[PDB]
Amino acid sequence: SGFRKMAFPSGKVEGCMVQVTCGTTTLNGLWLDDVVYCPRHVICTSEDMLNPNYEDLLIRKSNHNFLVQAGNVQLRVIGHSMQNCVLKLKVDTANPKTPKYKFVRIQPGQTFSVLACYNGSPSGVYQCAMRPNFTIKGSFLNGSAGSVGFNIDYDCVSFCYMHHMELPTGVHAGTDLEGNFYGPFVDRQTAQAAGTDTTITVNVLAWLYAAVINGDRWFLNRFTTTLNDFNLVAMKYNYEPLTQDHVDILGPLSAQTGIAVLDMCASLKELLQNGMNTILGSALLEDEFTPFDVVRQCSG
């Protein structure tokens, strides 16, 4: 019993984190096989940050300008290239602690474990979710660039995020492991701001199922309704539109509880005007838990 925001074991990811230094700028790097992945603003300086020419700054750089330090061994860089907003540093020695890994780009709402590192050394781990405005509400300080987000299915580490910068509101933005950012963000110190944040709906519904599973039932109400009734409350409260492929994903969570997907959808409306009148220690509908996170934790 018990429901908690728990992250994947970061052990296999900790074995791939190195430190990348170009001149005096330093961040974290992902050492997979003989290739190191890191954000491309490591080639910048404190003055090349307003309007950076990454393609020109890289032309002025050679292989010896990239200093990769993997614990005690300093890796000799014998190749470099740029792909979107990340750098690829080809080293002479493949990483012996390389796990089975693929690179994926997640959708907004999907969750992933963030291994916060500083100077190539892991600092902490925590679960994060792709917010609908294409940001993440994490905890990053200076030097956290290069920290990666991942999901673990068996032995496959699906790398899906790499940290880059922080927005003036406290949220963070990054790219996939191919360099493509998540949203309309760029690696420039220009005044950037994310769109208004909505609420992941399929995630609050899965969290609602985790309540009746682990104990909390004081909030249950008494209504059954259909699909169009769900839209009658979704747009006003900034709740993400439900899809039909979704209700198949909430299927197993609904059958295990005897309450159909749309049967639980009826409880949503009365919850949004007056509230709960604690639920797993939270007085709000938590949207940071995907249905996959509930099945993995509650019924696994």
Binding site: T25, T45, N142, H163, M165, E166, H172, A191
Partner: peptide, 8 residues
């Protein structure tokens, strides 16, 4: 807006 690398 801060790029979260250590600049010296």
């Amino acid at each position: 807006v801060k790029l979260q690398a250590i600049f010296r």
